A paper describes a structure:
Overall, the protein is organized into three distinct structural domains with interconnecting topological connectivities. The two NIF3 domains at the N- and C-terminus of the protein (henceforth denoted as NIF3-N and NIF3-C, respectively) have the same overall fold as canonical NIF3-like proteins, with a central 5 stranded mixed β-sheet and a pair of helices on either side. The middle region of the polypeptide (residues 126–236) bulges out between the two NIF3 domains and is structured as a classical PII-like fold with a (β/α/β)2 architecture, confirming our earlier prediction.
The two SA1388 monomers in the asymmetric unit tightly associate to form a dimer along the sides of the two NIF3 domains opposite to where the PII-domain is located. The PII-like domain juts out of the dimer on the side opposite the dimer interface and forms homotrimers by interacting with the PII-like domains of symmetry related molecules along the three-fold axes. In SA1388, the two entries to the central hollow space are capped by the two PII domain trimers. We observe clear electron density for two tightly bound metal ions at the junction of the two NIF3 domains in each SA1388 monomer close to the protein surface that face inside the hexameric toroid. We have therefore modelled two zinc atoms at the putative active site. Both metal atoms are tethered to the protein through several histidine and aspartate residues. Residue Glu329 is coordinated to both metal ions, while a water molecule, or more likely a hydroxide ion, also bridges the two metal ions. Additionally, we observe a clear electron density for a ligand of unknown identity in close proximity to the two bound zinc atoms that would provide two additional metal ligands, one to each of the two metal ions to complete the octahedral metal center configuration. The contours of the difference electron density map after final refinement suggests the presence of a head group directly ligated to the metal ions and a mostly aliphatic tail that has few specific polar interactions with the surrounding protein residues.
Residue numbers in the entry:
A (entry chain B), D (entry chain B), F (entry chain B): 1 to 161, 166 to 177, 195 to 370
B (entry chain A), C (entry chain A), E (entry chain A): 3 to 139, 201 to 370
């Protein structure tokens, strides 16, 4: 009997590749509207889950929408037949499930900013503004003959996974010859490590320490990348306008300024431009740039390009490609399509 | 007609104005479509999953609860918890209206209803809101604060003066609306006898009181739900005892040490508004010649079981 | 005379009272010496280094900008960034005056100016401030709220009464001042045609709108600069479209989903106040027989270049 | 000449067994009203120090009351002959001393929740919600021949207490063969360790490090325990109503729900119920449960019992027993009695 | 009678209303029993242990201090620090009353007392509070804001109208109460000569002033204690110099650079209220024919010794 | 061609000896008014940069003022010809540069409080209230034959500066014999250490850890010192009144109290007096003491002397001496003078 993919199965897969925990703590991510128990009939990717996107899912026979922007952000205080209420009610009434992969996708090594850089034809792309992840170096002290079965039992129970220990010789008190064994755990394992250590240790009152270690994460908001060939600011702006099919672009800085290194935060990344320049950027590319921030940037020589917040729409095809690949790996046959609807609230003239 | 949700909302607003609710509250049409024709109305304290099933079973597409099912914003709508209730409403085209603190402060609302279920006399609203009006000024006449704009559009439109002369003088008056009632028994009774009396009249499994059992009670202040914070002011207003729910140890100990008598009839005693609201709505419907069924939900939705 | 900075400040205050500015704003003489004789006045949106160089070159020692060059307090004055501009003003004895939110809310200010550059009709201030006056009371007569003290020093000084009897009755009236204007086109036009029309009239490189291109527009609300926050209220006030700058994605998406039409003419479109303010000041100077040159800065100070 | 116990001596003993530092930082604990210098004539334990409790101390000739709840919590702005003022004035006027052992006793391994679990007849009782205590692993580097007198001097001065060091061999710079010696200190000792190390080290400029270590405390708010035999929620509720002589109990959950593991926070512990369930509880037992929190718990399947906040009264006899034992150990002859007054503000009908 | 603490409190409230104290303050009966008969009253700035010993020694069971011995809530009452004082009061049945900011803003309070000790003329309260009254409205007459309730209970009780028509019109008037006095010397004097004059009249060990020593002084503003924050407003009100205590370096430097003259007479100079309050209370007692001894504490409680 | 000292050069020197980073985060320090590019013609030290001080710089031909107090503290919202505006405009109009060495000088081992103690003739002067500086112990694991060129490359690139490593032998997994090498970095180096380690390590995926270490700083607010000979509080007060030429001093405490150890925070240090007593002070010396704080101190037995905030004026001559010395070391010929103007806003009578 089959194991068709349920929303719960899809969530586990999504979380494996683009962990929901990497989203900012103010964000609203994951299954926003739906039922974990329901079988997935098809997946439509979207930037914003507008009414037209919901109609498109219905029309295609897909019961799952993955959007970048969370349709419910600050809690809803009503669900009436108007505004965002009309969209949420339509999802529910048609048994459509909506998952938001928001700032977790903004900070993912294969996420919105990698996608933007790739669509711009850039090279040497890497994550910037890296998160810090908390780990612990576990240190226990144990007699040499006790070292093996202590290690095997900790390893049998999934610690140091495999069997990754570092062994140090020393003398406790030199009353007692001991082996100081070390290994790494993620922050959530501390309590279980304690349990296992106390349980399988030789000493009645065993001696063990957790030393907090911070490591630079692979996750971070933005990428730094480079153009193949150093070019002028205005030429770079024109090139990316064309590549992303943007109706209008605006830039801040001398039009003939030479550009090689590019920092990109899709959406609304103003606030990071000065740090981007400190990180080596010649220009900071983002959306939703306002007058006074552009004015400040100009006077300080910080070069900007506004590609519009709407340029995050690249994640529809990008996430479709990712998900198709993840599904291939797992041998899952479910269709994924990028929504073709242009959902930009702005029309340019 | 037939009566739509939009028309029901207008009527309810007329009798229990939604603007008398507290600013933090969430009242009105919480879940639904104002264009839908009302098939029947079920009244509820809390809109539980069982209450939604009762509406469906009775053929009613409208529920009016006291407590707002959505209070702080909901950040997801999953098939779990409160999500299940909200999703069931939507999937069955059931409209949910919340008449919350507007009903707590209404002259015919929760506290009137409590006082009447208790058999009390000389019941009056306490803790009255303050309404703002303007005495428009040499002629003079009144206006609601909201008419100030239109009145001026009117005033400045026609007058002999190149610049007509007029004044809006802010006047404040005691509202008919407020949180709680003061009321009285027919004859003085002991605090313990009064507590038992109301236990029995409200069908409460357990009541608790603060104060000597032989304290004599004539004047009673009532705030249904969770009214702790108002007990000192009630005594100030003449109360021999403050009646509310959800009384906690330290608040009761403070009251005891200050000589303030309390009775905890439980928050759940607000359930009286089910039948109370059904009666009101039947009467309002009768005035407007609306032939729509109203029933009080019969489900006991108290999360507590007493032993 | 000759007119000093102190005299100019008095005049500007008379016509565009600095007290109508928002409490968070920074307006008035920001950089300078009130005793210095004005040689000429250059009007500006933003006081950039290029604008200071233009003043110097024209022989003008006074600049009036809309945007305050010093807004939050500056914690240093170095030869870098905004420091360079501030230091250049000081070292060339150039006086800088900021007519900021006081000009945004004036009946002849930024939004009147925008509406006129757009060719609009029936232009009126919206979002009006409220002025406080006192009806002094049996005689009765008016006073500005600021006269309450002096009036009383006067009132209590001479009266038959050992204790004269008098009342100050607070009266509130709609101000002539407020943020934004409502106005109308001569004949209904599509939203896209209106957007293009104003693009052309204001010489804007790029405009963007929210709403169906064939929406019909007659009534228009305008808040120059960054007026998002006021669009729902404008529709409430009758607007078919809200015109402002600095519109961001999520605010535009919200408006679109609620049926609220917008046009982003860019914050930089406040530049119309350069010529607008020059015309006002020339007229005021003419009334007072002041022979001082006023010119609108010709420098395009938009930090954005469009492609 | 005698050393009769003074309030100061009693405070030291109380603090040894139920450290005042384990109280929450918002709490008001310790000697609230009295004189450290005064000789203790007898001790009366209480939940709340009401006027009747003060009269009872006077009547018995006891000059010391230890309550759980602090009679002064937020500061008093007056001391008049009414309300709480009347109680505080009576203490002072009769030279009665009042000590509050409040949240320090809530979190103690022998405190309010252990007492509650014991009175309920539960087994396998352990502290939950454990505090974290900050320690340091001190690391110094020292030549082998210098190791002994360095160690002895640090130990003579009460560090590593005894003589608990761990010894590591290594090469500094291999210009210099060194011994890396390690030991533990509590957080308050850092400065003294620094002093002693600098003082007795071989090197003119000695090399030493303090590495912060967090350890799970023995102190925590609540206990987890189990019934001898799995029973129904309603049967468990009835049993504990009887054992604690409670006039009325209420529960939330299906009456026939099977219960084995019980989390208990006496007083007002709502806020911890969801975490208790994550920790393995079948039911969360507490007091002062309000409607909307009970409603939430019901819909989420979290089972609750309200035993009333007043059920903290078990600490009168419990603390009497503890104190009698502590006094026996120290050979102190001072009487301790649990106040017999029922001080519950509520009467049930 | 004999006069109880409750009666004393009523009298003091009549002459120096406790409601004129700041909302953050702690005034009234701080420590004591309102039912106890007053044996005698000692006045104090700070109620130190030495002042309590003085009361005990004189046979007085009532102390009135300016500064509240309990200000923020006390979290313990031990035989140490302030605990020792509070416990000594209680154990000797001594009643402590604090007349704090109510005395600072009274027309016969701390600042009147300072100005009189200085020999000044034309002394008037400054920084006046605002009292709210209602003109009840065709008859019309006044009421204190507190009478609004009773008046309405009365008003609505008897009238021809089924619904009587009445208005409460909020009127605001300048209070007699406020923080500080303005006053003047008989003849202009230098700032240094004035500072020395007041040093001598108040027996101050050390005074310090801000401003040129030859500045001419006629009009003086005084806020006893720690009145920094009010010096710019005092100059606005006509003061040549602002006199207060507890002046710090940066506040003095700011004043100096702005041309605002100051004198620091020390916070401790509020001690004048001991004799000042004794005289007031003797007079009030004389009016009511109360034969109770009042004495000003003779203890110098300044924590500072000057060298 | 010459390298005359520019403001930028002076700032680097100032920062070397009295690091601007040791200032409190609310403070406003460094070049407040001026141009980094401008050549320094002379330096005038000041407590407060009043108009007279600016006139004095002009008159002397000096274009640089270093003050203790920042003339711009909370941002200026205008620069008009009055008040502080007149002073700032005069600086600018005369091309005078103004640097503030504020709380960095309050906390410096040779700063305001060392200067005060020295002028008082005190002995055994040391910094109190020490800052804590964050460092990292870097730990990498590497095979023995790889140890040399790994070390040399890290050292070639300026880590462990020189060549300060500690070497530990151990077994990774005993599959692999490894050397655990350790060294110290300042907190700002973490990212570069990561770069260098990844770059020059043997392992494709090298194993390395940063362990946060806090060390007691040499910087702190205040000093503790002692009088040569134990003396009475009143005698000490009189002595320091004379030594600092103060017009009036006031003290709190019994006039015959014996004083040996003195804590000093020049300026306005009330808030630290209780901690000073805990640190061993017999008296806390500061300025701007107010009534109620003095009253509190008296009742608690905390002895105080108010030497006035203006007594920070000792830093004019003190900083002149320091700067002359720093300039001598660098062979810089620029004149430094302490402003002679008494800028105390107070006149005493
Ligand atoms: Zn994004
Ligand atoms: Zn976005
Ligand atoms: Zn209610
Ligand atoms: Zn309720
Ligand atoms: Zn504007
Ligand atoms: Zn603007
Ligand atoms: Zn407790
Ligand atoms: Zn408790
Ligand atoms: Zn005062
Ligand atoms: Zn005072
Ligand atoms: Zn300083
Ligand atoms: Zn200072």
């Amino acid at each position: 009997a089959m194991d068709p993919m349920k929303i719960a199965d899809l969530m586990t897969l999504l979380d494996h590749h683009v962990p929901f925990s990497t989203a900012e703590s103010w964000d609203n991510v994951g299954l926003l509207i739906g039922d974990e128990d329901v079988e997935v009939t098809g997946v439509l990717t979207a930037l914003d889950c507008t009414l037209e996107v919901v109609n498109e899912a219905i029309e295609k026979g897909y019961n799952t929408i993955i959007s970048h922007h969370p349709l419910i952000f600050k809690g809803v205080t009503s669900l009436k037949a108007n505004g965002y209420g009309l969209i949420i009610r339509k999802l529910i009434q048609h048994d459509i499930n909506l998952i938001a992969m928001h700032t977790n996708l903004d900070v993912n090594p294969h996420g919105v900013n990698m996608m933007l850089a790739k669509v711009m034809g850039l090279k040497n792309i890497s994550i910037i503004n890296n998160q810090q992840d908390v780990y612990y170096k576990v240190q226990t002290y144990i007699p040499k003959d006790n070292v093996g079965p202590f290690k095997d039992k900790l390893s049998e129970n999934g610690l140091a996974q495999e069997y990754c220990f570092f062994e140090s010789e020393g003398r406790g008190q030199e009353d007692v010859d001991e082996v100081k064994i070390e290994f790494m755990i993620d922050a959530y394992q501390k309590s279980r490590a304690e349990q296992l250590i106390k349980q399988y240790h030789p000493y009645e009152t065993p001696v063990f320490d957790f030393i907090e270690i911070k490591q630079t994460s692979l996750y971070g908001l933005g990428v730094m990348a480079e153009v193949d060939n150093q070019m002028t600011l205005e030429d770079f702006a024109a090139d990316i306008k064309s590549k992303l099919n943007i109706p209008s672009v605006r830039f801040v800085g001398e039009s003939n300024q030479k550009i090689k290194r590019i920092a990109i935060i899709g959406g609304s990344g103003i606030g990071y431009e000065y740090q981007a320049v400190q990180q080596g950027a010649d220009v900071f590319v983002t959306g939703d740039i306002k007058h006074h921030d552009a004015l400040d940037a100009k006077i300080h020589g910080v070069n900007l390009i506004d590609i519009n917040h709407y340029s995050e729409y690249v994640m529809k095809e990008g996430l479709k490609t990712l998900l198709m690949n993840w599904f291939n790996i797992e041998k899952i046959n479910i269709d994924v399509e990028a929504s073709t609807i242009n959902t930009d609230p702005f029309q340019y003239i």
